[PDB]
Amino acid sequence: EAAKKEKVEQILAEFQLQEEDLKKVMRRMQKEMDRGLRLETHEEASVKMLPTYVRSTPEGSEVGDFLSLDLGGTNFRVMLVKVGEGGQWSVKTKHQMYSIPEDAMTGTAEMLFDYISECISDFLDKHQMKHKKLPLGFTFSFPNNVVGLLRDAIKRRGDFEMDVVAMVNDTVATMISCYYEDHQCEVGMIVGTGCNACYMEEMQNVELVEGDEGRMCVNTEWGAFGDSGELDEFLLEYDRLVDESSANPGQQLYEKLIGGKYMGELVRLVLLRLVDENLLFHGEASEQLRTRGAFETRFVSQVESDTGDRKQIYNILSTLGLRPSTTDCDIVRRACESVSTRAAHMCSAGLAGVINRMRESRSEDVMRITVGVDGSVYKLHPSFKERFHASVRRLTPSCEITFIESEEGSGRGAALVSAVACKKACMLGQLEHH
Ligand SMILES: CS(=O)(=O)c1ccc([C@@H](CC2CCCC2)C(=O)Nc2nccs2)cc1
Ligand SMILES: OC[C@H]1O[C@H](O)[C@H](O)[C@@H](O)[C@@H]1O
Q: According to the 3-state scheme, what is the secondary structure of the chain? A: CHHHHHHHHHHHHHHCCCHHHHHHHHHHHHHHHHHHHCCCCCCCCCCCCEEEEEECCCCCCCCCEEEEEEEECCEEEEEEEEEECCCCCEEEEEEEEEECCCCCCCCCHHHHHHHHHHHHHHHHHHCCCHHHCCEEEEEEECCCCHHHHHHHHHHHHCCCCCEECCCCCHHHHHHHHHHHHCCCEEEEEEECCCEEEEEEEEHHHCCCCCCCCCEEEEECCHHHCCCCCCCHHHCCHHHHHHHHCCCCCCCCHHHHHHCHHHHHHHHHHHHHHHHHCCCCHHHCCCCCCCCCCCCCHHHHHHHHHCCCCCHHHHHHHHHCCCCCCHHHHHHHHHHHHHHHHHHHHHHHHHHHHHHHHHHHHHCCCCEEEEEEEECHHHHHCCCHHHHHHHHHHHHCCCEEEEEECCCCCCCHHHHHHHHHHHHHHHHCCCCCCC
CA of 321 to the centre of ligand 1 (A): 53
Q: Which of 338, 379, 374, 382 has its CA nearest to residue 140? A: 374
CA distance 247 to 262: 12
- Burial (CB count <10 Å: 0-12, 13-18, 19+), residue 250: exposed
Q: How many CB atoms lie within 10 A of CB 206?
A: 21
298: Cβ contacts below 8 Å, ≥ 6 apart: 264, 380
CA 80 to chain centre: 27
Report CA dihedral (271, 272, 275, 277) to the nearest 10 degrees: -110
- Kindly tell me the sign of the dihedral angle through the C-alpha atoms of 372, 374, 379, 381: negative
| Method by which the model was determined | X-ray
Q: Which amino acid is present at 249?
A: P
Question: Ramachandran region of residue 11, left (φ > 0), alpha (ψ -120 to 50) or beta?
Answer: alpha
**Quick check: 139 and 70 in contact, CB under 8 A?**
yes
Sheet holding 65-72, edge to edge: 90-99, 75-84, 65-72, 135-141, 163-164
Determine if residue 376 is labeled as part of a ligand binding site.
Answer: yes
Resolution (A): 1.8
Closest residue by Cα to atom 22, ligand 1, is 424
Q: How far is the CA of 98 from the centre of ligand 1 (A)?
A: 29
Does 66 show up as a binding residue in the annotation?
A: no
Contacts of 172 (CB under 8 A, 6+ apart): 52, 54, 188, 198, 217, 219
Q: Give, in words, the CATH class of 58-167+408-434.
A: alpha beta
Domain boundary assignment for the chain: 1-57+168-407, 58-167+408-434
Which residue is catalytic, options 121, 141, 228, 361? 141
Q: What distance in Å separates the CA atoms of residue 24 and residue 119, rounded to the nearest whole number?
A: 53
Annotated catalytic residue: which of 28, 35, 55, 77? Answer: 77
Ligand nearest to the CA of 350: 2
User: Of 210, 264, 254, 213, whose CA–CA distance to 230 is shortest?
Assistant: 254
CATH node for 1-57+168-407: 3.40.367.20
The answer to whether 70 is annotated as binding is: yes
Q: Is the CB of 179 under 6 A from ligand 1?
A: yes
Q: Which residues contact 129 (CB under 8 A, 6 or more apart)?
A: 65, 80
Q: Judge whether 169 and 97 are in contact, CB under 8 Å.
A: no
Contacts of 122 (CB under 8 A, 6+ apart): none
Burial class (CB in 10 A: 0-12, 13-18, 19+), 154: buried
Q: State phi, psi for 383 to the nearest 5 degrees.
A: -135, -5
Nearest 5 degrees, angle CA 145-CA 147-CA 152? 95
Cα 204–Cα 428–Cα 178 angle in degrees, nearest 5: 70
User: Is 333 an active-site residue?
Assistant: no
Residue 407 and residue 413: Cα distance in Å, rounded? 8
Q: How far apart are CA 275 and CA 229, in angstroms?
A: 31
Ligand 2 and 190: CB distance under 6 A: yes
Ligand nearest to the CA of 177: 1
Which one, of 380, 381, 383, 393, lies nearest residue 349 by Cα? 393
If phi > 0 it is left, if psi is from -120 to 50 it is alpha, else beta; for residue 128 that is: left
CB 137 within 8 A of CB 69: yes
In degrees and rounded to multiples of 5, residue 325 shows phi and psi of -75, 175
| Probe target for ligand 2 pocket from 48, 50, 175, 196, with the most ligand atoms within 8 Å of CB | 196
The angle formed by the CA atoms of residues 117, 118 and 121, to the nearest 5 degrees, is 85
CB-ligand 2 contact for 227 (6 Å cutoff): no
77 is catalytic: yes
The number of residues making up the chain comes to 434
**334 assigned to active site:** no
Residue 97 CA neighbour count, 13 Å, CB half: 8
Compute CA 193 distance to the chain's CA centroid, rounded to the nearest angstrom: 7
Q: Give 252 Cα–ligand 1 centroid separation in angstroms.
A: 31
Confirm or deny that 377 is annotated as ligand binding.
yes
Q: Hey, whose CA ends up nearest to atom 5 of ligand 2?
A: 194
Q: Is 196 in the pocket of ligand 2 (CB under 6 A)?
A: yes
Neighbours of 102 (CB within 10 A): 6
Q: How far is Cα 348 from Cα 25, in angstroms, rounded to an integer?
A: 10
**CB distance 327 to 310 below 8 Å:** no
Is the C-beta atom of 58 inside 6 A of ligand 1? yes
